[PDB]
Structures are given as structure tokens and as C-alpha cells.
Amino acid sequence: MKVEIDSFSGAKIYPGRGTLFVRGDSKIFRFQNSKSASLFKQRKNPRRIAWTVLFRKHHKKGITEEVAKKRSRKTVKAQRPITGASLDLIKERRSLKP
Amino acid sequence: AGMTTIVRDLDRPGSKFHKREVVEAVTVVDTPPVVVVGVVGYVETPRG
Amino acid sequence: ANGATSFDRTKKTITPMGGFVHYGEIKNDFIMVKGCIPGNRKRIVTLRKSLYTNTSRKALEEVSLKWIDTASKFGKGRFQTPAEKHAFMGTLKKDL
Amino acid sequence: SGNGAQGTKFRISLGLPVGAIMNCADNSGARNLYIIAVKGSGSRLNRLPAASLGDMVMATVKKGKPELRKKVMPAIVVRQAKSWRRRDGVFLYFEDNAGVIANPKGEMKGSAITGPVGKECADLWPRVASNSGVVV
Amino acid sequence: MKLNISYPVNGSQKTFEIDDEHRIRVFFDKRIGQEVDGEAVGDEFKGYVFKISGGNDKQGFPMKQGVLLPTRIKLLLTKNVSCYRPRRDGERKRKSVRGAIVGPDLAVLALVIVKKGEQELEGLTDTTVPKRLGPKRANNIRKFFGLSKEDDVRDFVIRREVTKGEKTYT
RNA sequence: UGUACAACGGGGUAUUGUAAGCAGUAGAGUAGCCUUGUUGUUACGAUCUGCUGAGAUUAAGCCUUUGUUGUCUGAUUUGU
RNA sequence: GAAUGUUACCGCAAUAGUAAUUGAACUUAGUACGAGAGGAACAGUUCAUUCGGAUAAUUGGUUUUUGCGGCUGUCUGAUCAGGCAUUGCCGCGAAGCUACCAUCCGCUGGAUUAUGGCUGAACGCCUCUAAGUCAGAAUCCAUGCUAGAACGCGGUGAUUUC
RNA sequence: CAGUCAAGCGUUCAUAGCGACAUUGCUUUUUGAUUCUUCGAUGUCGGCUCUUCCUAUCAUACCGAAGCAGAAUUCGGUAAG
RNA sequence: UGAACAGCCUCUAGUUGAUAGAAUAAUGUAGAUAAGGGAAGUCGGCAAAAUAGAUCCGUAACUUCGGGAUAAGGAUUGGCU
RNA sequence: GAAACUGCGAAUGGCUCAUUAAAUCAGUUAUCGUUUAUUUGAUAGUUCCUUUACUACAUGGUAUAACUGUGGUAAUUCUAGA
Ligand SMILES: [Mg+2]
Ligand SMILES: [Mg+2]
Ligand SMILES: [Mg+2]
Ligand SMILES: [Mg+2]
Ligand SMILES: [Mg+2]
Ligand SMILES: [Mg+2]
Ligand SMILES: [Mg+2]
Ligand SMILES: [Mg+2]
Ligand SMILES: [Mg+2]
Ligand SMILES: [Mg+2]
Ligand SMILES: [Mg+2]
Ligand SMILES: [Mg+2]
Ligand SMILES: [Mg+2]
Ligand SMILES: [Mg+2]
Ligand SMILES: [Mg+2]
Ligand SMILES: [Mg+2]
Ligand SMILES: [Mg+2]
Ligand SMILES: [Mg+2]
Ligand SMILES: [Mg+2]
Ligand SMILES: [Mg+2]
Ligand SMILES: [Mg+2]
Ligand SMILES: [Mg+2]
Ligand SMILES: [Mg+2]
Ligand SMILES: [Mg+2]
Ligand SMILES: [Mg+2]
Ligand SMILES: [Mg+2]
Ligand SMILES: [Mg+2]
Ligand SMILES: [Mg+2]
Ligand SMILES: [Mg+2]
Ligand SMILES: [Mg+2]
Ligand SMILES: [Mg+2]
Ligand SMILES: [Mg+2]
Ligand SMILES: [Mg+2]
Ligand SMILES: [Mg+2]
Ligand SMILES: [Mg+2]
Ligand SMILES: [Mg+2]
Ligand SMILES: [Mg+2]
Ligand SMILES: [Mg+2]
Ligand SMILES: [Mg+2]
Ligand SMILES: [Mg+2]
Ligand SMILES: [Mg+2]
Ligand SMILES: [Mg+2]
Ligand SMILES: [Mg+2]
Ligand SMILES: [Mg+2]
Ligand SMILES: [Mg+2]
Ligand SMILES: [Mg+2]
Ligand SMILES: [Mg+2]
Ligand SMILES: [Mg+2]
Ligand SMILES: [Mg+2]
Ligand SMILES: [Mg+2]
Ligand SMILES: [Mg+2]
Ligand SMILES: [Mg+2]
Ligand SMILES: [Mg+2]
Ligand SMILES: [Mg+2]
Ligand SMILES: [Mg+2]
Ligand SMILES: [Mg+2]
Ligand SMILES: [Mg+2]
Ligand SMILES: [Mg+2]
Ligand SMILES: [Mg+2]
Ligand SMILES: [Mg+2]
Ligand SMILES: [Mg+2]
Ligand SMILES: [Mg+2]
Ligand SMILES: [Mg+2]
Ligand SMILES: [Mg+2]
Ligand SMILES: [Mg+2]
Ligand SMILES: [Mg+2]
Ligand SMILES: [Mg+2]
Ligand SMILES: [Mg+2]
Ligand SMILES: [Mg+2]
Ligand SMILES: [Mg+2]
Ligand SMILES: [Mg+2]
Ligand SMILES: [Mg+2]
Ligand SMILES: [Mg+2]
Ligand SMILES: [Mg+2]
Ligand SMILES: [Mg+2]
Ligand SMILES: [Mg+2]
Ligand SMILES: [Mg+2]
Ligand SMILES: [Mg+2]
Ligand SMILES: [Mg+2]
Ligand SMILES: [Mg+2]
Ligand SMILES: [Mg+2]
Ligand SMILES: [Mg+2]
Ligand SMILES: [Mg+2]
Ligand SMILES: [Mg+2]
Ligand SMILES: [Mg+2]
Ligand SMILES: [Mg+2]
Ligand SMILES: [Mg+2]
Ligand SMILES: [Mg+2]
Ligand SMILES: [Mg+2]
Ligand SMILES: [Mg+2]
Ligand SMILES: [Mg+2]
Ligand SMILES: [Mg+2]
């Protein structure tokens, strides 16, 4: 059960819902309802239709907290040395100086 | 009360839609418990 | 989670967004029967046991739902829960 | 349907009644296909037979190679337009009515099908799955 | 689907196999690079945090960070790019590719441990594997040991023993 | 005279597709006064942008309600 | 819808009506039959046709929701907000109604016909028939479904005082 | 439209399927023959639409027969659901 | 407004006269829309739909050389500056 | 001395005669109208910085192949994560 999305308006298309259009070049366009489907058949440009995802994304509308920092990092520092060259004598000679 | 849609895997060995999803329409009947308040006895007669 | 499934999981009843149109909410047990039934919404109905034992195979098939549409029936509903709707839409001029 | 269609077909909306003309989709010289009959259709006083996706009709070539015109020949509907609904619950429709000329057994006449094809047609006649670009 | 887990602190890696759609479903709609808290994937991976790094769908096509789309696409790929090694100077090719959005259409996820949980994972936390080669350029040796441009390398370079049988070489 | 009924009001659900007002260094540009400008200044300019997925409508055969106001004995007839 | 005391609820069932239809594919099986060429069917599965009764989750149609938006002409000084053009025009448009253009459901018992038989005389033999009897059809009678006799019926509730 | 006799047809074989010369019938969607009814008026053809009925059954159910190996077909029965 | 005495809106003047009320069944009369097909409908494209102004480009047979011709076929059109 | 990186080469060769009619081609000009790997010959004291408490020159930075290892596809000179 895949919840598709509207290739014009960008709404979720839950099962058995809306229409599916298979264009000449074999490109599929899934519409959630007749509104997007007619607006599509009208050569309407979703980036000019205020209420669409594609319009909002392009106009940076309401995004707020995605352009807000997060926290996803770590801290490692473990030694393996070199294969064939005693990983033991690679920490004792690794006593360094400055 | 109303109708709605349902998705389920069909189990029909031999059908082109065996083990595939279908969407089917279903009605919903509101069904709160009936309360019993009497019994009625019927006898058979040559007139029914 | 009347309207949830072994595969849906999410807490939600069968009542669609904004409720069964021309009806109400369903706050009690219910029978969910496949297909359509004679008579219309709000009408007293009688569910009756079958009169013969059907070996149909079509009847016999044990069924388990995957998903029960709970989107509003008052329009072209796009959202199952008010949760789901808020997720996709964001905060609004009312709201927080 | 019928001869050499291994498989059944689940019923789908009838979009092409008799006298409809659909793009010839193969590469045999025919340019369009004029439906004069549907194979395995039934009788009802004043009902026009109609074809759906994957049906087998009887056509004549209205525009095409002269050695292909003025005669009857089978054909297979490969693309609809009249939106039908599948058992997974989708209502889908092609951009054009289209079909490919075939023989009673169901083998094609040309060596390719140009444009996409519906699965319910390709699932039904193998030699269409042979020559199919993108399906559905 | 098959998870392909890498412990890059140990250089360890091993594939696990997960059935049960609910356990998997945790990865769905998650992008490449999104971290995933483990306990949802199992109790063995309690606390473990997995960064999603890539993987292949059925039919074997690779993912490609940055595409979005839980579908496949067909892109124009270039030198210095993922899922393509050119064969010829300034050659581009149009190749299919799977989208960085996880879906049940995937044969294999590819995960990279970031934080370790409360329990050990066998062929991963328990084993450790050595970094094949060691520094070769001068200053990299002085920075794999910290020495100052005084200590002279020559005797700080690595030395790998390998034997002729009765002639062990260095 | 009460999990009463009604009229409004609130919340939900829908439809459309961003209200009026105000602001702007957006705007092909254009005028007018000199103190003729090292943004001179004051306005004006289809449209654009921001407050604004805003505003507006939403039961008339949608859903819901601790709020507000109100209503709750007129008429006729019937017996083995 | 008057009248069989009033009124109410729950029921019976006389009589009447009645309904489903046809095809293909898989498989049986390249099987039985055949020198070959050719070439079945019963059981099982999946669908279909013609018909019928509903139904509106979905998809489609419809639009005076004159709901939102848009456009022309003009009239209210401008603005806002509007009027008028027999519903001014256009896009979208919920609700309702609605489409093999959409979805869902369409029961199983008995008795027979033809026909093939059993036992068996007439007629020491023989005969499915004379007595008796078995198996049998898209038939018929039921089951089921729709009315419910407004002069067919039962069960039950309450039954008025100035 | 259907019988009866059976000389013939059917390699052989009257009657599987047919059938001459004759002869007996049925039917009343043929056409005639008649002129009874209507000329102070019974709206003339076909089609559309829709119901119902007949069976001398084209299909579908179950059967009998074949000059029925199978497949196909022909003759027949109960049958107008 | 526009080519206009056209249509549509308005000033002056003049009307607001045409039984009324409540509903919005069937069937109508008058006004409209319909997915996919596109005359298969029908005696017959009956009815209906389609086209349409203007500026530009482009225009066949045949001809009594006057035409045929808006032949056919295209593109363009607001507002503001 | 495999693999791989890096460099160069693959724009030569070979084949065909379809297009092409002032085009190609030819003989003759022009670059005072331009590009040119290579070959051959030449050609480079200057690079920092308010200009004493100096700037790695005794030589400054990582990020990758091959490789190890974990993988995906029926399938290719497909390639992913580590
Ligand atoms: Mg609609
Ligand atoms: Mg099937
Ligand atoms: Mg209510
Ligand atoms: Mg609805
Ligand atoms: Mg509704
Ligand atoms: Mg007809
Ligand atoms: Mg369609
Ligand atoms: Mg081929
Ligand atoms: Mg293909
Ligand atoms: Mg009141
Ligand atoms: Mg505004
Ligand atoms: Mg303000
Ligand atoms: Mg806005
Ligand atoms: Mg009403
Ligand atoms: Mg309040
Ligand atoms: Mg008295
Ligand atoms: Mg076989
Ligand atoms: Mg064979
Ligand atoms: Mg033989
Ligand atoms: Mg129903
Ligand atoms: Mg409309
Ligand atoms: Mg308006
Ligand atoms: Mg203003
Ligand atoms: Mg007026
Ligand atoms: Mg007028
Ligand atoms: Mg009008
Ligand atoms: Mg407009
Ligand atoms: Mg609707
Ligand atoms: Mg209606
Ligand atoms: Mg159907
Ligand atoms: Mg039907
Ligand atoms: Mg059925
Ligand atoms: Mg029944
Ligand atoms: Mg029964
Ligand atoms: Mg009986
Ligand atoms: Mg017996
Ligand atoms: Mg016997
Ligand atoms: Mg005798
Ligand atoms: Mg008998
Ligand atoms: Mg007897
Ligand atoms: Mg006898
Ligand atoms: Mg029957
Ligand atoms: Mg009944
Ligand atoms: Mg009676
Ligand atoms: Mg009466
Ligand atoms: Mg009665
Ligand atoms: Mg009685
Ligand atoms: Mg009674
Ligand atoms: Mg009584
Ligand atoms: Mg004789
Ligand atoms: Mg004989
Ligand atoms: Mg003879
Ligand atoms: Mg005889
Ligand atoms: Mg005789
Ligand atoms: Mg007679
Ligand atoms: Mg007679
Ligand atoms: Mg006759
Ligand atoms: Mg006469
Ligand atoms: Mg008379
Ligand atoms: Mg008369
Ligand atoms: Mg008469
Ligand atoms: Mg007359
Ligand atoms: Mg013989
Ligand atoms: Mg034979
Ligand atoms: Mg045969
Ligand atoms: Mg018989
Ligand atoms: Mg007989
Ligand atoms: Mg009958
Ligand atoms: Mg009868
Ligand atoms: Mg005028
Ligand atoms: Mg009058
Ligand atoms: Mg009136
Ligand atoms: Mg009407
Ligand atoms: Mg139409
Ligand atoms: Mg259309
Ligand atoms: Mg057309
Ligand atoms: Mg005709
Ligand atoms: Mg035509
Ligand atoms: Mg006709
Ligand atoms: Mg005529
Ligand atoms: Mg005619
Ligand atoms: Mg005429
Ligand atoms: Mg015409
Ligand atoms: Mg006419
Ligand atoms: Mg006309
Ligand atoms: Mg139109
Ligand atoms: Mg002409
Ligand atoms: Mg034109
Ligand atoms: Mg312009
Ligand atoms: Mg190289
Ligand atoms: Mg060469
Ligand atoms: Mg780097």
C-alpha cells in the first residue's frame, strides 16, 4: 500500500483515490482530484498556483524549523595500526614527543 | 451510518489478483446492543 | 483504534474527518460489511444470518484488512487524522 | 478476445464502440484502425459493440498503405482514453485510443509497437509483450 | 530487507536480515544521511544509532544521495560522480539510479553506526580489523606519530613482516 | 422543565486560492520644485512583494457543542 | 379511505406475482479414439455475456451553494463595496441526484417428462408394464423473494368520569 | 406444413438419411373465390416503442438413432423456461 | 462601448399595468451541460453543435476574365508604460 | 613486476561515393585576417611585506584508485556502503 503524491499539487494520494494519466511519451501523472487534473490539463504552472507544494517550496513558505539547526555527530579515536606490521609495536613506538 | 474504502490482500488461488492488494467499498452499520424485553411463542396450525 | 489495523497501527476510529456525513460519529459496536446495503443513512436495518451454508470459496475466504480510509467524506478529503493533516500542512494563523 | 488469447480478462470500461477510429500503433504501414466489430461481444437491441484495452476487434485501415486498405483484419486495442478502474483501485487513462493489427491467432503484423501499452493487454497476448516498449 | 551495517571505528562490517514489515517500516521515507534509533529495528540494536548511507533496490540499481524521490530515475552522469565510472575521456552516460528515499522496493539498506548501544553486536563490536597500509609521505608520518621536523622518519616508517617459509622478510 | 427543543455564537469538516488595510530599496516608467544633487527631494505608475494557505462561504438534507437568548396545556374527537 | 367498541405495538399467511441467462480460458490433455491427419468430455479454478435489485466509499456527469476566484460593457464622483446584460461570460466547485461511465448482491430442496432400467406375468419361452418399482430435464411444486384479503386471522399494551 | 403404400436412391442394403407412381390430411402470416358486417366514416403502408401469446424449436437443458472410431454432423423425443 | 439608428448599460420623460398564496411529484413547454466514442441514430445530420469581429500572411479547379474568394489554410488581439 | 593512478594516443589508418552543379575540385593567389599538440632553435636573478623582534625552503595540504572487506541484480567492460 503506497500513498502516492499528486504530480501537480503535491498532495498525498491514498489508495483508490483520484486519477492516473499516462501521457504519450509514457510519463505517468497522478492527480489527487479533478482540481489538479483540470489545472494540469489547462497548462497551468504549479509554481504560480499559490496552494501547491511546488509553489510553496519555491517561495520558501512556512518552512521555519527545517532551516533550524539540529545535532547529529560523534567522537571516535581508536587505533588499528597496519596489517602485517605488528599492531602492538605501533602504539609503543607511537609514544610521540611534541 | 456510511460507506468507506478498504485495502486488503486478496487470497484467491488462480486469480490474476491472488496475493495482490485490492481496494473494496464497504458500508458501516451502527450497532449498539439490543436489549431483550420479551419472548413470544408460536404454535403450528393447519392454517399456518 | 477502531479504524486501525494490524498493518495501520495508528489510533483512530472508523468515523471520518468531520464525521459520517448526514449521520454522526459511531460511538459503539458496529458491523462493517463489504459492499453496499439496501436502504439509506440513518435507516433502521436488519442484519440476518444466512439461510444456507455457502461453500463459495469467495465466501469462506478469511479476510484481514490492511487499511480503512478515514478521510473526510464531506469533500475530497486528503487527510486521515487531524494529526496527519497538521503534519503535512504546518502551523496556521489560528493555532499555536 | 478468444483465439490465442491465453488468459482471462477482468472487465474494464468500454471506450471504443463500432465506427471509432484509433491510432495504428505498430509499424506495418497502417496509420489508423476503424472498428467494425468486437470479438466475443453480446447482443442487445440497439447496443453498439465496444472494445476495451486488450480486446480483439475487426478493423479496416482508413489511412495507410494501399496494400493494406479496403479490407478487414483483426486488431488488438492497446491504449484506451476512456478511464477504467483496476482491482488495485486506480482510475487511469491513456492519452489516445490505439491498437495494433494482428491475425486471428493473435500474432502481430509489424515488428514493434510505438508508444506505451496497458498491462491488461500485454498480459493477455504474448506477442504484444514481446514488442512492448513501456507497459502501463 | 537486508541491512548492511558498517562499524567504521573498528573497520567492521556485516549484513543482517530483517523480516516483519513493521520493524523495517522505520526506515521508510527516511533519506540518506538521516539517523535512525535502533530499538525500533530490533532489541539487539537497542540504543544503537544508524546513519543511512545508501544501498541497492531489487534489480540491483544503486541509490544516489541528493535525488529525493522514492522512485527510480535515469540521469546523465559524469566523471567524479556516484554510480558511474567513465570509460573514456570526457564521456557521459545515461544510467538508471534509485532514489535516496528508502522504500520497500529496496533489496539492501546500507547503514553506518554512529553511536553504540548498550549491547555488543557480534561480528562488529566484538571484532576489530587493521588499517591495511600505513603512512608513506614524510609529513603524514610526522602526523601519524607527532614528531616535529627533528625526529627523522626512516625508523618511524612501518615495517611489514612476510615470510619465504624459512626466510622471514621485512 | 431535560444526555429537552429552537435561534445565534464557538470548535470541526469542506470549497476557493491569498481579503480589505498598510507597508516596501520591487516596478516598464513618468511628472513638478529648486539648494541642479558624488541615491537631491516630493509625490504619482499596470503589476509585484510582505503581514496572508489569507479572506470569504460552510446546511440550507455536513459534524459537534458545559456559551448566549428564548420556548414548553391551543383545537377536535373516540366506549365493549 | 367511512364502517364492524376506541387506540397502539408485535405478528400470521390465503391468494397473487417471481428470475436469472449464455459464453470463454486454465486444467483434464495433445489425454481417451485413430493408420494417420486429427481430436473430446464429467470433476476442479479463473473470468465473461445478456438480465435483474440495490447502492454512491471511490471515479465520472450535473451546478442557482449564484460558494470562492476571474473577465467584458456600463451605472453609483473616486475608493471600498455593489446594481444591471431573461441565470451576462469563464475556471474551480462541495451537497444532492446520478452511470456497465461507478461499486455491490442475484437462494436450494422435492416431485416429474422424455429416456434408460429393476422385478414380472399375460404367453411354462420372452418382454422397462399389465400389478408394483429405480434413475432421470433450462419442466413442475416447494424453499427463497415482493404484495398482504382495505368485508381472512392471531398475540399483546393501554383503555376517558365533571 | 405433415402422413400412408414402397418401385427406387443410398458400393452391398426399400425405410441410417431419402423417396417415384399413387393416395389421405392438416394449416389460415400466401393468393384467390365469396360479399355477411361497416359508405350520417372502424384513420391507409413501413418503421420506432412495448407487451403478451402460438410452436410447425434456430440456440440453450436431458435424452433416443445413425451409412455415430474420434472431432464434426444429420434424424428423432420431453421441451416455448 | 462599438463600424453603427446593432446588441448591452444609462439621463430626460413614462411606466412598475399582465389574479394571488404555498409547494417544487410524474409528464411537459422554454433555457442549458454531459465522460469515451463520434451519424453507428434517421427516409434524410431533422435538431443541435461547430464557425464568426478585426490586422496580417496565404489562397485551387474552372471562367463569359467581370469572377470563383471571407475560396481553402494559418498567426495575431488585454492591461499598462 | 600484475593491478591501478598519471602521461600520451585513439582526430592517423582503412572503407565507401550517398549527398554535392559555382559547390567540390584544379591551376593560381591571400592572411597587413587567424589557430596550431608536436619537432627543431631560442627565451626567465624581480614572486613575501608598513619593509627589527618574521614568512615551512633541510621542501607546506588532503583525498582517492588499485587493495582489503561487507553487498545488491536474470542480465553488460553495472557498481553501492565501509
Ligand atoms: Mg466532481
Ligand atoms: Mg482474473
Ligand atoms: Mg443531526
Ligand atoms: Mg462525498
Ligand atoms: Mg458525500
Ligand atoms: Mg434499432
Ligand atoms: Mg475517460
Ligand atoms: Mg521481437
Ligand atoms: Mg520493455
Ligand atoms: Mg425559540
Ligand atoms: Mg490584500
Ligand atoms: Mg492594517
Ligand atoms: Mg500569500
Ligand atoms: Mg427536498
Ligand atoms: Mg460561545
Ligand atoms: Mg353509550
Ligand atoms: Mg496443452
Ligand atoms: Mg497436433
Ligand atoms: Mg481410421
Ligand atoms: Mg445494493
Ligand atoms: Mg459549469
Ligand atoms: Mg462572481
Ligand atoms: Mg486603495
Ligand atoms: Mg437600472
Ligand atoms: Mg433588455
Ligand atoms: Mg441569460
Ligand atoms: Mg477568464
Ligand atoms: Mg459529485
Ligand atoms: Mg436529482
Ligand atoms: Mg462492474
Ligand atoms: Mg447492472
Ligand atoms: Mg455473481
Ligand atoms: Mg433469491
Ligand atoms: Mg434456501
Ligand atoms: Mg414436492
Ligand atoms: Mg426397481
Ligand atoms: Mg430385466
Ligand atoms: Mg407362445
Ligand atoms: Mg417407465
Ligand atoms: Mg406400471
Ligand atoms: Mg400387457
Ligand atoms: Mg431454472
Ligand atoms: Mg419472501
Ligand atoms: Mg378475503
Ligand atoms: Mg376499498
Ligand atoms: Mg388487512
Ligand atoms: Mg385466516
Ligand atoms: Mg388484528
Ligand atoms: Mg386482536
Ligand atoms: Mg409401388
Ligand atoms: Mg440397409
Ligand atoms: Mg439398390
Ligand atoms: Mg415407410
Ligand atoms: Mg393414402
Ligand atoms: Mg381442413
Ligand atoms: Mg379457413
Ligand atoms: Mg404462407
Ligand atoms: Mg369484403
Ligand atoms: Mg358507422
Ligand atoms: Mg371516428
Ligand atoms: Mg379506433
Ligand atoms: Mg377522417
Ligand atoms: Mg451399413
Ligand atoms: Mg466418423
Ligand atoms: Mg474436426
Ligand atoms: Mg427421447
Ligand atoms: Mg421419439
Ligand atoms: Mg416464455
Ligand atoms: Mg406456456
Ligand atoms: Mg448604442
Ligand atoms: Mg393573462
Ligand atoms: Mg401561481
Ligand atoms: Mg422537467
Ligand atoms: Mg459526449
Ligand atoms: Mg469530450
Ligand atoms: Mg472527430
Ligand atoms: Mg445509416
Ligand atoms: Mg463517416
Ligand atoms: Mg434508416
Ligand atoms: Mg431520401
Ligand atoms: Mg436508407
Ligand atoms: Mg425528402
Ligand atoms: Mg453532415
Ligand atoms: Mg425532420
Ligand atoms: Mg439544421
Ligand atoms: Mg462545447
Ligand atoms: Mg468553391
Ligand atoms: Mg479559417
Ligand atoms: Mg501585447
Ligand atoms: Mg591513461
Ligand atoms: Mg582518413
Ligand atoms: Mg578534499
PDB file of C-alpha atoms (C1' of nucleotides) in Angstrom, chain G residues 43-149:
ATOM      1  C1'   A G  43     -14.982 -33.061 -11.506  1.00  0.00           C
ATOM      2  C1'   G G  44     -11.913 -28.578 -10.162  1.00  0.00           C
ATOM      3  C1'   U G  45     -10.304 -22.915 -10.969  1.00  0.00           C
ATOM      4  C1'   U G  46     -10.448 -18.132 -13.069  1.00  0.00           C
ATOM      5  C1'   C G  47     -13.308 -14.711 -15.641  1.00  0.00           C
ATOM      6  C1'   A G  48     -17.013 -13.062 -19.080  1.00  0.00           C
ATOM      7  C1'   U G  49     -22.186 -12.040 -21.826  1.00  0.00           C
ATOM      8  C1'   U G  50     -27.439 -10.857 -21.782  1.00  0.00           C
ATOM      9  C1'   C G  51     -30.849  -9.927 -17.410  1.00  0.00           C
ATOM     10  C1'   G G  52     -32.249  -8.290 -12.575  1.00  0.00           C
ATOM     11  C1'   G G  53     -32.316  -5.484  -7.315  1.00  0.00           C
ATOM     12  C1'   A G  54     -29.815  -2.131  -4.966  1.00  0.00           C
ATOM     13  C1'   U G  55     -26.182   1.452  -3.841  1.00  0.00           C
ATOM     14  C1'   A G  56     -22.868   6.497  -4.027  1.00  0.00           C
ATOM     15  C1'   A G  57     -16.507   4.852  -0.323  1.00  0.00           C
ATOM     16  C1'   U G  58     -14.214   5.876  -4.929  1.00  0.00           C
ATOM     17  C1'   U G  59     -14.092   7.868 -10.459  1.00  0.00           C
ATOM     18  C1'   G G  60     -17.130  10.375 -13.852  1.00  0.00           C
ATOM     19  C1'   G G  61     -21.522  13.731 -15.178  1.00  0.00           C
ATOM     20  C1'   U G  62     -24.569  17.638 -13.476  1.00  0.00           C
ATOM     21  C1'   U G  63     -24.155  23.412 -10.778  1.00  0.00           C
ATOM     22  C1'   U G  64     -28.895  28.886  -8.652  1.00  0.00           C
ATOM     23  C1'   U G  65     -24.229  26.592  -2.970  1.00  0.00           C
ATOM     24  C1'   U G  66     -25.081  32.255  -7.776  1.00  0.00           C
ATOM     25  C1'   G G  67     -19.524  29.183  -2.659  1.00  0.00           C
ATOM     26  C1'   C G  68     -14.629  31.273  -3.910  1.00  0.00           C
ATOM     27  C1'   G G  69     -11.831  33.460  -7.773  1.00  0.00           C
ATOM     28  C1'   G G  70     -11.509  35.614 -12.699  1.00  0.00           C
ATOM     29  C1'   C G  71     -13.274  38.775 -17.388  1.00  0.00           C
ATOM     30  C1'   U G  72     -16.243  42.284 -20.752  1.00  0.00           C
ATOM     31  C1'   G G  73     -19.784  46.552 -21.137  1.00  0.00           C
ATOM     32  C1'   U G  74     -21.920  50.181 -18.276  1.00  0.00           C
ATOM     33  C1'   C G  75     -24.324  52.882 -13.985  1.00  0.00           C
ATOM     34  C1'   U G  76     -23.187  54.538  -8.172  1.00  0.00           C
ATOM     35  C1'   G G  77     -17.932  61.298  -8.303  1.00  0.00           C
ATOM     36  C1'   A G  78     -13.160  58.249  -6.742  1.00  0.00           C
ATOM     37  C1'   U G  79     -12.039  54.358  -3.057  1.00  0.00           C
ATOM     38  C1'   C G  80     -14.329  50.218  -0.803  1.00  0.00           C
ATOM     39  C1'   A G  81     -18.462  47.617  -1.873  1.00  0.00           C
ATOM     40  C1'   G G  82     -22.018  46.887  -5.464  1.00  0.00           C
ATOM     41  C1'   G G  83     -26.537  47.140  -9.458  1.00  0.00           C
ATOM     42  C1'   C G  84     -27.941  45.904 -14.432  1.00  0.00           C
ATOM     43  C1'   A G  85     -26.951  42.460 -19.501  1.00  0.00           C
ATOM     44  C1'   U G  86     -34.448  36.770 -19.257  1.00  0.00           C
ATOM     45  C1'   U G  87     -29.044  32.869 -14.539  1.00  0.00           C
ATOM     46  C1'   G G  88     -24.059  38.364 -18.638  1.00  0.00           C
ATOM     47  C1'   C G  89     -19.370  35.090 -19.727  1.00  0.00           C
ATOM     48  C1'   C G  90     -15.022  31.680 -17.824  1.00  0.00           C
ATOM     49  C1'   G G  91     -12.044  28.196 -14.230  1.00  0.00           C
ATOM     50  C1'   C G  92     -12.866  25.542  -9.893  1.00  0.00           C
ATOM     51  C1'   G G  93     -16.707  23.970  -7.296  1.00  0.00           C
ATOM     52  C1'   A G  94     -18.931  20.887  -2.028  1.00  0.00           C
ATOM     53  C1'   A G  95     -24.182  18.577  -1.097  1.00  0.00           C
ATOM     54  C1'   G G  96     -27.746  16.062  -3.715  1.00  0.00           C
ATOM     55  C1'   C G  97     -29.266  13.257  -7.775  1.00  0.00           C
ATOM     56  C1'   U G  98     -26.751  10.008 -10.826  1.00  0.00           C
ATOM     57  C1'   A G  99     -23.558   5.992 -14.873  1.00  0.00           C
ATOM     58  C1'   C G 100     -21.671  -1.460 -17.171  1.00  0.00           C
ATOM     59  C1'   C G 101     -19.132   5.646 -17.487  1.00  0.00           C
ATOM     60  C1'   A G 102     -19.234   3.801 -10.974  1.00  0.00           C
ATOM     61  C1'   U G 103     -19.495  -0.259  -6.915  1.00  0.00           C
ATOM     62  C1'   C G 104     -22.166  -4.355  -4.538  1.00  0.00           C
ATOM     63  C1'   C G 105     -25.563  -8.901  -4.110  1.00  0.00           C
ATOM     64  C1'   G G 106     -28.637 -12.279  -7.502  1.00  0.00           C
ATOM     65  C1'   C G 107     -31.121 -18.920  -2.699  1.00  0.00           C
ATOM     66  C1'   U G 108     -31.641 -24.907  -2.559  1.00  0.00           C
ATOM     67  C1'   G G 109     -34.854 -28.665  -1.654  1.00  0.00           C
ATOM     68  C1'   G G 110     -38.676 -32.237  -3.649  1.00  0.00           C
ATOM     69  C1'   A G 111     -41.734 -34.090  -7.397  1.00  0.00           C
ATOM     70  C1'   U G 112     -41.787 -35.487 -12.716  1.00  0.00           C
ATOM     71  C1'   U G 113     -41.145 -35.697 -18.638  1.00  0.00           C
ATOM     72  C1'   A G 114     -38.555 -37.960 -22.485  1.00  0.00           C
ATOM     73  C1'   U G 115     -35.388 -41.726 -21.976  1.00  0.00           C
ATOM     74  C1'   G G 116     -32.559 -45.809 -19.868  1.00  0.00           C
ATOM     75  C1'   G G 117     -33.787 -49.635 -16.179  1.00  0.00           C
ATOM     76  C1'   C G 118     -35.452 -53.220 -11.887  1.00  0.00           C
ATOM     77  C1'   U G 119     -38.702 -57.087 -10.580  1.00  0.00           C
ATOM     78  C1'   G G 120     -42.626 -59.532 -13.773  1.00  0.00           C
ATOM     79  C1'   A G 121     -46.936 -62.030 -15.654  1.00  0.00           C
ATOM     80  C1'   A G 122     -50.240 -62.060 -19.529  1.00  0.00           C
ATOM     81  C1'   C G 123     -47.849 -66.164 -23.330  1.00  0.00           C
ATOM     82  C1'   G G 124     -44.212 -72.806 -18.820  1.00  0.00           C
ATOM     83  C1'   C G 125     -40.305 -69.072 -23.528  1.00  0.00           C
ATOM     84  C1'   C G 126     -39.709 -63.788 -23.779  1.00  0.00           C
ATOM     85  C1'   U G 127     -40.707 -58.775 -22.523  1.00  0.00           C
ATOM     86  C1'   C G 128     -38.955 -51.363 -18.765  1.00  0.00           C
ATOM     87  C1'   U G 129     -45.614 -52.723 -17.774  1.00  0.00           C
ATOM     88  C1'   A G 130     -50.266 -55.254 -17.256  1.00  0.00           C
ATOM     89  C1'   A G 131     -49.880 -55.075 -10.894  1.00  0.00           C
ATOM     90  C1'   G G 132     -45.538 -52.911  -8.269  1.00  0.00           C
ATOM     91  C1'   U G 133     -40.688 -50.092  -8.902  1.00  0.00           C
ATOM     92  C1'   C G 134     -35.358 -47.344  -9.785  1.00  0.00           C
ATOM     93  C1'   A G 135     -32.691 -43.389 -12.102  1.00  0.00           C
ATOM     94  C1'   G G 136     -33.866 -39.013 -14.575  1.00  0.00           C
ATOM     95  C1'   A G 137     -34.538 -32.222 -17.930  1.00  0.00           C
ATOM     96  C1'   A G 138     -33.351 -24.945 -18.852  1.00  0.00           C
ATOM     97  C1'   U G 139     -40.097 -28.555 -16.749  1.00  0.00           C
ATOM     98  C1'   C G 140     -43.214 -28.525 -12.331  1.00  0.00           C
ATOM     99  C1'   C G 141     -44.137 -27.842  -6.650  1.00  0.00           C
ATOM    100  C1'   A G 142     -41.801 -26.027  -2.916  1.00  0.00           C
ATOM    101  C1'   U G 143     -37.635 -23.229  -0.331  1.00  0.00           C
ATOM    102  C1'   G G 144     -36.414 -18.011  -1.118  1.00  0.00           C
ATOM    103  C1'   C G 145     -38.057 -13.031  -2.650  1.00  0.00           C
ATOM    104  C1'   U G 146     -42.467  -8.897  -3.414  1.00  0.00           C
ATOM    105  C1'   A G 147     -47.701  -7.687  -2.178  1.00  0.00           C
ATOM    106  C1'   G G 148     -50.926  -8.727   2.153  1.00  0.00           C
ATOM    107  C1'   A G 149     -57.526 -10.345   1.605  1.00  0.00           C
TER     108        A G 149
END
